Design a protein around this ligand. Sequence first.
Ligand SMILES: NCCOc1ccccc1
Length: 330
Amino acid sequence: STGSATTTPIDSLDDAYITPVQIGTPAQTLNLDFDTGSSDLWVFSSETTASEVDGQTIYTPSKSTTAKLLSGATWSISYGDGSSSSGDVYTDTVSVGGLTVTGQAVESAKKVSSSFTEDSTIDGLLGLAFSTLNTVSPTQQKTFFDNAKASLDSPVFTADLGYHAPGTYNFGFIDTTAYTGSITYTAVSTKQGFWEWTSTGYAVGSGTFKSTSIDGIADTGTTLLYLPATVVSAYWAQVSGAKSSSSVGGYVFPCSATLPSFTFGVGSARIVIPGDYIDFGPISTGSSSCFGGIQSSAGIGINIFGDVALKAAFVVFNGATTPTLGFASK
Ligand SMILES: NCCOc1ccccc1
């Protein structure tokens, strides 16, 4: 089997991407944030504290003839940005782009933090990291991809995120029309539960490529590119007036600037992030200070190849017995 679904930016900045997902019988369609950095499929629901729902579409398990309470199971997750959610668990039929999994754990939120309440466009998250990170207790649950994998034509999914435009998540096949050149594959460590790999270096603009190993994660659920402070300083040094602002929380730059590109290495191959992808617009409405799309990972404990980086590539998440990642230009 295969599936193919379009993913759409939630706003003009590509802050996140939402993908429609069919849950239950008859189908209830919710727009979920596919997150290769976590491993829980959770949704706003009829159980979510009413004051914490503000415009999201909810899953109502009592209206699904295939929903079953997973008795005794609870979940609670805290994300790197400080957001969180928690609740109980149902199993139900879940379909993405024509690919159906029966008995998928659908984690129903009883509580969500303010950042989720405020994002009326995100009805929940669909985790695509390794199932070892799933938070369901006392019986850990499998991701949608883990449950689908044996049925898929090939045990892979691909992320093709758009810049200020829709893109695609495919399951079970590689669309050879969706990228240019060849796909370069690189090793993955699953020891932390992430799609963790090592980039071979970077360049700023037209500058020379610096060969240096950068361990980080391919994370569709993180907006920006978070890299070591040395690398980030070298980038922003090429932008007149750019500075790290403690009050804003990262590097800012004059909105009048033209940003240089940023290149990252995948083996001997190179992925070029155009400068415009690094512009996240005014820090507040009407400001002439703009927020940068490349930020330091120093306070995080891991480097994160988030959407800023991934949207410059066609990315293969290869879930074979030894997982790997593939990157192609597009
Ligand atoms: N990276 C996992 C958490 O992602 C989000 C997405 C939207 C709001 C808050 C957190």
